[PDB]
Amino acid sequence: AVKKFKPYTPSRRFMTVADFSEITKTEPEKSLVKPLKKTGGRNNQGRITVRFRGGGHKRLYRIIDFKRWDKVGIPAKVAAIEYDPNRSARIALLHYVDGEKRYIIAPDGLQVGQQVVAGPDAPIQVGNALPLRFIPVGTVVHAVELEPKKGAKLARAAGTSAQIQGREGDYVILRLPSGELRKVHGECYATVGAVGNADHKNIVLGKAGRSRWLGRRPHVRGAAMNPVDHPHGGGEGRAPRGRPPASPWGWQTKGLKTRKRRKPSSRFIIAR
Amino acid sequence: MKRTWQPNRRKRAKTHGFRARMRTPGGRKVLKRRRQKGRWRLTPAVRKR
RNA sequence: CGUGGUUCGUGGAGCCAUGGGGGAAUCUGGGCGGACCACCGCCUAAGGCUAAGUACUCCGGGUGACCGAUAGCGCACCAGU
RNA sequence: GGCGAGCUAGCCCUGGCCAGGGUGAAGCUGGGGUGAGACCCAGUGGAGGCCCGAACCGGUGGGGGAUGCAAACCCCUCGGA
RNA sequence: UGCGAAUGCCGGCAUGAGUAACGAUAAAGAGGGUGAGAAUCCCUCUCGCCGUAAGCCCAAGGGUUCCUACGCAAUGGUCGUCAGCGUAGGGUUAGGCGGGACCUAAGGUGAAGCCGAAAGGCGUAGCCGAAGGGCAGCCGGUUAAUAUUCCGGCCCUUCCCGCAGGUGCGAUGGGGGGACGCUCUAGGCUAGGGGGACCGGAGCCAUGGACGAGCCCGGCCAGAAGCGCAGGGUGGGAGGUAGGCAAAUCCGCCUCCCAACAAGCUCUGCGUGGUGGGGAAGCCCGUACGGGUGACAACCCCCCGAAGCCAGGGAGCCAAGAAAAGCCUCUAAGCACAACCUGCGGGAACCCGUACCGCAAACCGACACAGGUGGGCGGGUGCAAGAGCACUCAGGCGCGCGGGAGAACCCUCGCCAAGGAACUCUGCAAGUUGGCCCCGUAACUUCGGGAGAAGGGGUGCUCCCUGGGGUGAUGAGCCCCGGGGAGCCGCAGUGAACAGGCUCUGGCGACUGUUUACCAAAAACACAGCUCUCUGCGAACUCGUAAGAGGAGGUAUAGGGAGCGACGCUUGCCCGGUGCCGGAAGGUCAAGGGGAGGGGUGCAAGCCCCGAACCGAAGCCCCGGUGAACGGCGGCCGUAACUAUAACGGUCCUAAGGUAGCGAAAUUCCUUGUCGGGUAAGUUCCGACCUGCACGAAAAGCGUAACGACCGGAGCGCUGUCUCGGCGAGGGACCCGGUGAAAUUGAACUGGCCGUGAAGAUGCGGCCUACCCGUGGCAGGACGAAAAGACCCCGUGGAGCUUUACUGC
RNA sequence: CACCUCGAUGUCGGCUCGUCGCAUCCUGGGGCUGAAGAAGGUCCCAAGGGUUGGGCUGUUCGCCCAUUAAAGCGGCACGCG
RNA sequence: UGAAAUGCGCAGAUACCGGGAGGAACGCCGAUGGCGAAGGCAGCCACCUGGUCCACCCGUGACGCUGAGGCGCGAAAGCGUGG
RNA sequence: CCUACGGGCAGGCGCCGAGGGUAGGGCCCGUGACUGGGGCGAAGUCGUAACAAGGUAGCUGUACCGGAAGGUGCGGCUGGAUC
RNA sequence: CGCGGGGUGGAGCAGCCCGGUAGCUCGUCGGGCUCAUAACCCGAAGGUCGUCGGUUCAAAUCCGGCCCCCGCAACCA
RNA sequence: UUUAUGUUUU
């Protein structure tokens, strides 16, 4: 669902919040596996390399399992579903029969107390991981490896997913959450299901502050600047751009393509 | 109203101190310059303990 | 091929050096005498060392058609205070 | 070529501070309502870049000060809290 | 090598001038003392001022300022016998407080490693790094000056050694734990406070009365074990085991079995506790203070009561809230006549800090500067509460020039007949309003608001009756909330202090918020939210020569860039140009390949040069697409059976000729457009029209409740704003004593008029007027002062910025 | 026009305070009248004094309301920061 | 298409074959038929589920009809959020 | 003051009270720059939507567009001519 | 009076550079189709080129003056 | 597959 609020202040009026009923007991997270401490800095060494960041709630890092082949054939029970502040998705805490503990990014529908496992063995029901080669064409799956053993990279975002479109040689063809068609090696793990908590896209920060809590500091338009600061600075009386719309550093920000032209990657693609 | 000097003994040593001068080659040169002029103090005097 | 050095700012541009590419020979070998060619000459690259004559004045000394306390060093005096 | 973020701006780690009033969201419990509901009413509850207002943070209008008490201050007033 | 000028440079001394000032308007008076000298030093008494401080205790920073003796040249805004000043002497005592022989944070540094012309930059571990974690001292007494430091009492820590008892002992390694948010909170306590008819106590009865259950003062502090009341923390067995980078008997997971409760086991807080310690007023002394007694002091009941403690308590919420060591456990080597554990005993416990100032005369501000500076304590009464306000304890102060006088004028205040915005750019300013309780409250609305709407009533004291709550008992007291009735007094009862004036109607911005430190707080920025665009992850993008890093330990519901800016209803047409996007052709196109063919020189083999076809990228050309990409979105002429006007037509151009909706507007030049409304009267304001100089749709269009120290218009209220001033107060001004500046200054023996003059004369001409010198006053002149005009030009001066200027990176 | 002034001659309007000119707005005295009277017109003399309060706009100025004997024009660095 | 033109196509179209992607609608059966209160409902399968008819003459005993308000359904277009 | 005085009267205070005042609401009527459409008025303008298949069958709810009638999309009705 | 563009049958546009002839759509007139009008078809008429002067052999055209028209400019002050 | 229209009153 989602939480709305009576307008008992302005901005409590438009504010929408996450529906946390999905979250099995939680409140304190799980030390041991996670958290580590999160070094919370907004710049590289010395200097700001990404604008308008900083502030926002102190945040512990749950350390999550992106290589499932790590324990093949060992099953595990889903102990809890918890809130993880470092991602849009939610994490499942799962107890292996080894008595080993891992967090997994929690797929849609995976429910507490269900057996989960990974390997080529791998029942094709939800929350299970397999090399892509053994997942049946047409199945919707998440947390893909882009190259084998390198760890899950694709479709980790709240409610994201990828479909398996076909197979070619040792590679299989995915349609990624973006709509790009990509070949990915067969030996790459993935995990059946979509990511879940897809209502994520519909929350409404509601007010200046809520954007601060998330570590997001005010973003100022070139238009509002001086020409020293930006292509769009100056003139005032406001102004149209007066040139092709640009970034602070001068490149065109409407339409100009970016991806490096000659890229080895380039040969495994096929879409938008 | 709050002025520019807000002395803090730890700052002063950590900033203009003898050891801080010796890391930076820029600083080793200050010491060299100061020493050659025969300044009685190569480094701001600081104190306590 | 790209540059530097020389008086040489591409110039007829050699010489010396060399970032890149190709890439030898050992006296009947190789470099040079200002593009190149012939002739005639000079010299032996791709290892190293080498006093003296030369430069300077923190330091000591001797001199002054040098100053003489607003001068002469910033400081003749407990001043790089 | 150095020296500066002991002022100021942003951020990072770690601590601290916000009298006292006011309004009374959700949710709960009960009651009614219905096929079941939506829902309505109470009571409880105690949310909010909510309200009033000290500390604290400000610097709105005016007056004064103008070789000042002050190289930005003082009084009255006012904004957040 | 000769100085008069350079707003020259260095110095000295003048001018203003005995002029301004002497630094908060909290405030002083007298008596005595000291002394060469006293408003200023000491002491007494009276008066005033702080008291969520202007009192007290920490931390910074300061670094002798501390205490005492002797001093007054200078410093002190006057004086000084005094001092934070001169001289000298003293003064800072810790196993337990802080910090270090502990830990880790950001960050720093950095074996390995990586990178860089050199300098150097990165960087895992490690190391450094604290107001965080960890760790054992409480009360009182002593000094002129230190005290959790010395002393006294009560109490603990670690290390070493030794005994006794116990156990597989053993770690930098495994595991537990340390360990964590915000808001709101429960129960019990403690600090703290108020009362007492009770206990203790010097004394006191005035001035009309009171010998009284009178007045006045005080009725505690710390304390091991044990004990009690609170509360925190924890399940206990067994079997399996493949995980916790070795190994675990530990932790983890699975299955059984007991408990489910704090029961227990603990650990804290509080109480009590052997004992130790304090202990008023007043009076007597002596100060320069402290000391005697009060005393064998008393030492108790009740109430209020934390934001503090039990603490890792609980509940709710989303934005989801350090680490490491100490600590416990597990095992590994090893070693097990070791070791470790517990108890007792003896010994052993180092380095630094410790004075004083610390909201300020001792710190930052050149100053004994009305500024600035973090944490804790901060009593009492009343006022709804409170840290607010008034008075006030403790404690601390009267601010380091005084005395008079009673002018103008200024500042800061108080009052005002009648009027009541007539003032003015404007109600600027100041008035009004003002707390609580109750009654009562409209448009509109996003149903929350708008609301403190508006507008009213009440408000003190007295006696009587009376309902609940907390402690106590189910009671008395003492607290706490009230309710009803009858009276009393004044002009007035939140009797002083703190404490909104209100309404209507536009513009801009949705809102809280942000900003030009020191002339702009806004309609500017930001903001949730909408769109576009980039980006498949060694992402784009940013910083860096690099290594590396941020992005992100993120992954398209994510991240960068850009516009727009809640929300509502919407956002039209043009792709010709520019940009971007697509385009396996074609045109052009550099090096390079290629060498038809030519040239130099040789006897020649040759060496050496040019060099046409042709094959050669991107880019440009070229073809398409694209508007929430840069952007653009017409002209003339005619036409209706009154006239007007033109639904209609003609023609010229264009890539397309502006849709809706707005419109004399934050836009309208003409302009105070015209009409309506408000007003006695309206260049503004409100509503219309549309002839829009020169609106128009995400440099958004048009609206919108709420919000606003924004900007406009109007009314009520009420006023010294004003007609139009008056009086009054205090700080100055003025006179006297003390101290005593400043810019400015060619020199001066420095008048008016009409002329003249480089065109605005004290300075020249003519005339006029005029004894010498001051003091308080006003500003017309000295083209008064200040700043080598910021405007303007000029200089082949400079700088920031722009681009389809040039040229480069 | 570019003469003093760019090592500074502060610039509109208001307010306060005036002072002066007369080419007189009122009041006093006059001639002429197409002056019956009353009331005007027009010129002459005359600068003694007087010359209102509001609405609008920053405005000067104008327009307007209500009055008046009248609501005068100018100069004084568009008098006077 | 009336005829055409715009458009598309030598940058290799149309026509043809193979492969893939995606969305929408269900030919024949199909009827002048069936179901539903209505709006409406059409490939196939499964699950959940409404109405309705017939046979038997077994059970209740008038428990019925209609129905202002109320409540629910309601083609197409249209609106909000996401696809 | 009068008494036939445990009284009456004058007089004083109080409740309520016509109304007046202040403040804010609700209903109705009149009127208003301007503005919207409507009715009606022999022979003005533009077109031709409808009536015959109306020369695109018509109508319809809705949506968008356009000087005007109207046009077009979606679904619906036959109140559609035609072999 | 600053700079730029313009004035051509009845309307709207060409033609002007570079000389010599004035062209397009509409409108007008005559005739057709029609019962009739318009549409439609076949024919025709109509301009000294704002104006005066100049240049040339010849001027809508090149040049100068004046009259009108449209657009832009009027800044620091 | 080119068409539109027919002044008012009897």
Ligand SMILES: NC[C@@H]1O[C@H](O[C@H]2[C@@H](O)[C@H](O[C@@H]3[C@@H](O)[C@H](N)C[C@H](N)[C@H]3O[C@H]3O[C@H](CO)[C@@H](O)[C@H](O)[C@H]3N)O[C@@H]2CO)[C@H](N)[C@@H](O)[C@@H]1O
């Ligand atoms: N009642 C007529 C309503 O309005 C319109 O009708 C109005 C107009 O359309 C109509 O105007 C007509 C016009 O159509 C027609 N083509 C020309 C005719 N002369 C006009 O007539 C009109 O104008 C003249 C004045 O000259 C009047 O005298 C005459 O009465 C009047 N109807 O006159 C009507 C006013 O009465 C609609 N046609 C009609 O459907 C609607 O119901």
Ligand SMILES: [Mg+2]
């Ligand atoms: Mg670093």
Ligand SMILES: [Mg+2]
């Ligand atoms: Mg650094």
Ligand SMILES: [Mg+2]
């Ligand atoms: Mg979102």
Ligand SMILES: [Mg+2]
């Ligand atoms: Mg922004």
Ligand SMILES: [Mg+2]
């Ligand atoms: Mg700007």
Ligand SMILES: [Mg+2]
């Ligand atoms: Mg900059």
Ligand SMILES: [Mg+2]
């Ligand atoms: Mg720029």
Ligand SMILES: [Mg+2]
């Ligand atoms: Mg710009």
Ligand SMILES: [Mg+2]
């Ligand atoms: Mg502008």
Ligand SMILES: [Mg+2]
């Ligand atoms: Mg501050």
Ligand SMILES: [Mg+2]
């Ligand atoms: Mg300084």
Ligand SMILES: [Mg+2]
């Ligand atoms: Mg420090």
Ligand SMILES: [Mg+2]
């Ligand atoms: Mg610091």
Ligand SMILES: [Mg+2]
């Ligand atoms: Mg020395």
Ligand SMILES: [Mg+2]
């Ligand atoms: Mg060279």
